[PDB]
Amino acid sequence: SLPVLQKESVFQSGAHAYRIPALLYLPGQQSLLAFAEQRAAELIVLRRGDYDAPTHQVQWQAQEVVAQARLDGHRSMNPCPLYDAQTGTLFLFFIAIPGQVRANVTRLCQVTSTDHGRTWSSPRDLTDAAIGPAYREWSTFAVGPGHCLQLNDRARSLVVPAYAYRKLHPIQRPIPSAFCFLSHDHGRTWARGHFVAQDTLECQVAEVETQRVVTLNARSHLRARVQAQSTNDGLDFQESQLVKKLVEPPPQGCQGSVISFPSPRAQWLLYTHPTHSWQRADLGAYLNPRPPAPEAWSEPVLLAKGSCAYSDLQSMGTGPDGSPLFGCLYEANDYEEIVFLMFTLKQAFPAEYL
Ligand SMILES: *[C@]1(C(=O)O)O[C@@H]([C@H](O)[C@H](O)CO)[C@H](NC(C)=O)[C@@H](O)[C@H]1F
C-alpha cells in the first residue's frame, strides 16, 4: 500500500450512516468540500477542509447538513458538486425521491452557493425542463455521484454525468444507460444528452485536449468497465467499449472515479476503483497516460487495503514534491466510514516521472 501524504476518516457511522462520497477542490481557496449521504437516503452533509501544504495536511472543519438540498417529503441523494470558474458559483446537483420508498417519481435538483459552500440558495427542480417527454419512458435515474465537469469550450459548458433506467421492452426489466446533462448558459437551461449503451450505470466524465474530448467512464453489469467518448461536448458518445484492464466486481459492479490532470510533459487521466475481481476490496489507482486510448490504461497501484467501495477524485494542483497532487474520498470498512486520502503522482506512479 502506497505512501500517502494523509489518510483520515472524515465521516463514520454513529447516530447516522454515511455513504456516497463527493469531493470538490476550490483552487483559489486551497480548500476542499467533502460531501456524503447521511442516512437513518435522508439528507446530504458537508465538511470543508483547508489544505496547508507545508504541513502536508488538510484540516477538516465540522460536519454540517446542507439544509437547502432537500424537497418536502423527499430523501436527497447522489451529491454532484461542480465549481463554475467563470461565475464563481458553486453547484450541487442531487436526486430527490419520495419518503414512502414502476412509475418515475425521481426528481432532479440543484442548489447553489456563492460563498464557497457556507450558505446555499433554495433548490431548483430541474426535472421537467431537463428531461422532457423521456421522463415517462424511465423508471428512475440518478446523477453522478461525484464531481461533475466544466469544459473550456466557448460557453464554459457544464456536464453532469448521469444514468437512466429505461423501460425498453415490456417483458424486460428497465435497462440502465449512462448519459450527460448539458448546459451552455451556466446552469440556467439544461439538455439531456444521448445515451451511451445498454447496461451502464454510475459514470463520471473528464475533458482531454489531444481538439476537445469528453471521456466517460461507466459502471457495468459485465466484468469490465465501459468507456465512451464525445467530440461534441457530451451530446453524443460516438465510440464506446469495454476496458478489460479496469475490472468490475460481482453482482453488478462498483462506482469508481475518473479525473484529468496536466501532463508532466496535454492531460493524463487518473481513475480509482476497487481492484479485486471478486469483491469490493482494495482501492487501486490507474493512470491513463495516452488518453483516452483504452489499452493505455495502467496496472492498478494499491492505495488502500481491505474493504473499499465508491470513490471520488479531485486534482488539487501541485503537490509538495512538485508533481500533480490528488485528493481522494472513498467508502471503507463495509461502509462504516468515508476516508480522505491525499497523495501525489510521484508517490503513486514513480516510474512515469513527477
Ligand atoms: C450503489 C452500490 O452499488 O452500492 O448502487 C446504486 C444503485 O443501486 C446501482 O446504481 C444499481 O441501480 C445506489 N444508488 C441509489 C440512487 O440508490 C447507491 O446508493 C449504492 F448502493
Describe this structure in words.
With 354 residues, this protein is an all-beta fold. The chain has a single domain (1-354), classed as Neuraminidase (6 Propeller). Helices cover 3% and strands 54% of the residues. The chain has helices at 127-131, 345-348, and strands at residues 6-12, 17-26, 31-39, 43-52, 57-60, 64-65, 74-84, 89-98, 107-113, 124-125, 138-143, 149-150, 158-166, 175-183, 191-192, 200-209, 212-220, 224-230, 239-247, 257-262, 267-274, 281-288, 301-318, 324-332, 337-344. A 7-stranded antiparallel β-sheet has the order 1-25-24-23-22-21-20. Strands 2, 3, 4, 5 and 6 form a 5-stranded antiparallel β-sheet that branches. Strands 11, 12, 13, 14 and 15 form a 5-stranded antiparallel β-sheet that branches. The ligand *[C@]1(C(=O)O)O[C@@H]([C@H](O)[C@H](O)CO)[C@H](NC(C)=O)[C@@H](O)[C@H]1F binds at residues 20, 77-78, 142, 201-202. It is an enzyme of class 3 (hydrolase). Keywords: Carbohydrate metabolism, Cytoplasm, Glycosidase, Hydrolase, Lipid degradation, Lipid metabolism, Repeat. One of its GO terms (molecular function) is exo-alpha-sialidase activity.
